[PDB]
Design an enzyme around this catalytic site. Structure first.
Site, mmCIF file in Angstrom:
data_model
loop_
_atom_site.group_PDB
_atom_site.id
_atom_site.type_symbol
_atom_site.label_atom_id
_atom_site.label_comp_id
_atom_site.label_asym_id
_atom_site.label_seq_id
_atom_site.Cartn_x
_atom_site.Cartn_y
_atom_site.Cartn_z
ATOM 1 N N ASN A 124 -0.038 -8.240 -0.318
ATOM 2 C CA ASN A 124 1.160 -8.863 0.239
ATOM 3 C C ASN A 124 1.343 -8.577 1.727
ATOM 4 O OD1 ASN A 124 2.083 -6.159 -0.505
ATOM 5 N ND2 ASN A 124 4.151 -6.926 -0.151
ATOM 6 N N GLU A 159 2.694 3.942 -4.354
ATOM 7 C CA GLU A 159 3.800 3.028 -4.120
ATOM 8 C C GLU A 159 3.698 1.916 -5.161
ATOM 9 O OE1 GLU A 159 3.262 1.804 0.127
ATOM 10 O OE2 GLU A 159 4.437 3.634 0.551
ATOM 11 N N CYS A 168 7.656 -5.157 -1.631
ATOM 12 C CA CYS A 168 8.032 -4.108 -2.572
ATOM 13 C C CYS A 168 9.530 -3.835 -2.420
ATOM 14 C CB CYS A 168 7.220 -2.824 -2.288
ATOM 15 S SG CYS A 168 5.419 -2.914 -2.578
#
Ligand code: NDP
Ligand code: NDP
Ligand code: NI
Lengths: 485, 482
Positions: free
Chosen positions: A149, A247, A281
């Site tokens: 992303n 993450e 995120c």
């Protein structure tokens, strides 16, 4: 374009000879052939990293900083290339990629700036004549596994900082964003870092990544990706006792109270919830509004979402939204939409999808049982829930498995601080977007969102360890044998 | 004898008890719970409920609670000593040490509670204040060993508590009564119910529940490297963090410029204290050729003087027993392997009941079990080496990273060796087991993950929370038309 691995200072073919064809998510057009690497490639890079390790870790911090500064100057020249590739391979708009390239520049500079300054401690001894100090030592070769992303900025935040503090690196980019990885390797090469200090191997996660995660000479893995995959990596890392930074994503609350500028709250909401098609995120994935502004808010938010321009991100610089990364994402979004519809949600707008493009689907009349309240929706499907009070807002905000970021819009200092205090997240923002990020600040979640923090010294921290060293200047008596004298 | 859960002492839900016996004479000490999953779950849910109340109060109130624990501990000192001896096999000097150190540990947690700071950051954006807060992780599992069960348990417990976490504690099964006394101390200090919980049961049941459970945020563990590996892997399922202390084979490097007699007294204390069952014990002794012969002579000379006896006998007893028959059996294997590989047994080798004498070896090599594995017990290799590079090569050749030491008067040699040895801790001209309450205690390699003591303990049990406030309105890139 000839895309290759980069191992031990050399751009190199995969030993297999295998190649995948990477195509654009936009029109499906071919981008480049890229390596499909195996376990041996990973192994080669790992050993390169382990041999480069001592030389790299034992030069003074200033030398490593000079290397990162060189990296910075190379990157500055490569900006347009990075942007083009981020748009073509990643589906990013001009603004998404400009933002990411700028932030990357900042990240590199940051690691450079901090390299000489990461300090240990000098301690007081409870013992009589004793020097007691604590040193920072680098961990070793660090595996770095990154998502598609924001492949550039995320990758570079891990790489630059890990390098700065004396670790070496083997890096496997996302399978959907190989050329970004390759370009990072071009940068490192042109910067002339010592061979083996940074290694790039492009290959499927279950093969390359698996090797990186299980290898004996790998000290640490830092991984940004899906929460399940992160649980896997976490468990497999335990065998070799390597540490991890994970993450794992979020579902971030954006809580709008009743005293806000409602139009401004809607503009902010649209940016934070839909930017990069919601694949962030820290995207604001769950919008929680006070009932006193709820209707006007919803109407304005939808008004602005309607305004969003979705198109080929190559076209011009004003495109708001490009496509989703692949067909799988569109399918998943369709599942979320299907679920919400079947659960009685009102689809206020969007849901249209052609190819990898998806027009943002906004839902109201949602409850806590909706898939889009219970799962991270990485993409352009957004719930808006209405709450009667601050307590309910907080209850809904914390009603997720995720811990990452969150934000509250309000002018009331007490409500702002109380909600900030009560929201369970690794990060919180008063009167800004959920996705605020700086190069030097601890970035990471609690709960299912992950383990550890990255950016600046927090990254240094993930990739180093404390070494307690003492010097005793006086001679002591000992309790055994008790017969002495 | 009473799990402690949610403020009350109680039976396990199974009702299943177990007899625990002294390693010294084998006598009955106490009946203790054999707890099941449900007991653990109850302790955990209690911890979890107590969590918000405990975390949210000001740090000074928790510090107050720890100062009360301190006062109580000071009252309970001889109880703790007694139990450490009878259930743990510790000599008077060793249990006195552990108690003194535990007192310092609790005091240290209390001292630091009010002081753990976040940061105020410079922001790269206009009109934004940017700070980082510390926050307690949650309920924290604490799983401890039998060798220093009091001081290790209390380092974990006290520091975890100070900073706003709730605890579920499962002591080593070989030292359950020490666990109980801790719970006794906590209860008399009057911490809020659920803040601290003791459940005494088997590792694979109670511990498994602690490590796999949803509401446990973190596990700090001290024990077998294999067990540690398992716990680390099972932790992944819920994404809970772990602190892991897995032991060491610490090098003690003795150079040629040392006072040899002194080097020997030091070596004997470091290698054999508490029968060598210490994670930082000097497990592999490394001597420079030039002093090697006189060193060995003197080391053996002092080993000769070590009294092994019922540690209850009197305060000058140097060594008590091992913890159980299993440890004797294992020590026996280490000795037999060393002899069978042609190791020269310089002294010792006799065992009785749980007692095992120091067994000392030379002419060993890297394939010996006592060079390849952590020997947690009084069997020690002495290895002679030609020079510093060789000292270091041997020191580093091991899976373990915990601590290490070098004896020498040369500053350069001291610092070269200290830098080159791969260990989480290192001591120039002192024992390998130096430990202070506020220092970063931990290793690298197979020795584990994380650090404990002071702010390092606080660190294992807290997280950073980045918070910003933005004071200016901003213009947004989407929609571009706007
Ligand atoms: O966000 P998003 O990128 O979708 O999150 P993902 O988890 O899907 O991707 C994150 C990274 O993890 C990799 N991955 C998948 N399985 C493993 C594994 N067993 N070991 C190591 N890495 C693995 C991926 O490689 P890849 O993209 O090649 O599958 C990717 O580079
Ligand atoms: O040194 P030493 O104490 O012998 O090292 P150990 O690893 O054998 O013991 C350390 C602690 O861990 C416990 N333990 C053993 N297995 C597990 C497990 N699967 N999960 C959680 N805890 C466990 C032990 O309890 P126990 O001794 O009761 O098994 C003990 O309290
Ligand atoms: Ni840490």
């Amino acid at each position: 374009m000839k895309v290759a691995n980069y191992i031990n200072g050399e751009f190199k073919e995969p030993s297999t000879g295998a190649f995948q064809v990477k195509t654009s998510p936009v029109d499906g057009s071919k981008i480049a052939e890229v390596p499909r690497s195996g376990r041996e490639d990973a192994r080669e890079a790992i050993d390169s990293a382990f041999e480069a390790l001592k030389a790299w870790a034992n030069i003074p911090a200033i030398r490593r900083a000079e290397y990162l500064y060189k990296m910075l100057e190379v990157f500055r020249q490569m900006k347009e290339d990075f942007m083009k590739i981020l748009t073509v391979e990643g589906g990013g708009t001009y603004r998404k990629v400009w933002g990411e390239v700028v932030f990357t520049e900042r990240l590199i500079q940051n690691a450079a700036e901090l390299a000489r300054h990461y300090q240990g401690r000098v301690l007081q001894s409870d013992s009589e004549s004793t020097i007691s100090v604590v040193f920072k030592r680098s961990k070793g070769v660090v595996g770095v596994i990154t998502p598609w992303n924001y492949p550039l900025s995320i990758s570079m935040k891990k790489i630059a900082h890990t390098l700065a503090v004396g670790n070496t690196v083997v890096y496997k980019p996302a399978s959907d964003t190989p050329v970004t990885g390759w370009l990072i390797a071009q940068m490192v090469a042109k910067a002339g870092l010592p061979k083996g200090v940074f290694n790039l191997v492009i290959g499927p996660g279950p093969v390359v990544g698996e090797e990186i995660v299980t290898h004996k000479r790998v000290a640490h893995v830092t991984f940004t990706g899906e929460s399940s995959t992160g649980r896997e990596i976490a468990a497999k890392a335990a065998g070799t006792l390597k540490t991890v930074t994970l993450e794992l994503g979020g579902s971030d609350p954006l809580i709008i109270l009743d005293d806000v500028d409602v139009d401004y709250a809607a503009r902010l909401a649209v940016f934070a919830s839909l930017f990069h098609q919601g694949q962030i995120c820290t995207s604001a994935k769950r919008i929680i509004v006070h009932k006193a502004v709820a209707d006007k808010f919803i109407e304005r938010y939808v008004h602005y979402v309607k305004m969003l321009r979705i198109d080929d991100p190559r076209k011009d610089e004003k495109v708001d939204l490009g496509p989703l990364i692949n067909e799988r994402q569109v399918a998943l979004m369709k599942e979320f939409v299907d679920d919400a519809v079947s659960r009685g949600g009102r689809l206020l707008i969007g849901g249209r999808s052609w190819g990898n493009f998806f027009e943002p689907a906004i839902f109201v009349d949602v409850d806590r049982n909706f898939r889009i309240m219970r799962e991270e929706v990485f993409g352009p499907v957004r719930p808006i829930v209405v709450v009667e009070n601050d307590d309910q807002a907080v209850e809904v905000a914390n009603d997720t498995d995720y811990g990452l970021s969150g934000a509250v819009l309000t002018n009331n200092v007490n409500r702002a601080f109380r909600i900030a205090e009560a929201v369970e997240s690794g990060m919180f923002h008063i009167n800004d977007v959920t996705f605020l990020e700086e190069s030097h600040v601890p970035f990471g979640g609690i709960k299912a969102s992950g383990v550890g923090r990255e950016g600046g010294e927090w990254s240094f921290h993930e990739t180093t360890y404390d070494r307690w060293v003492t010097v005793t200047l006086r001679t002591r008596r000992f309790p055994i044998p008790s017969a002495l004298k």
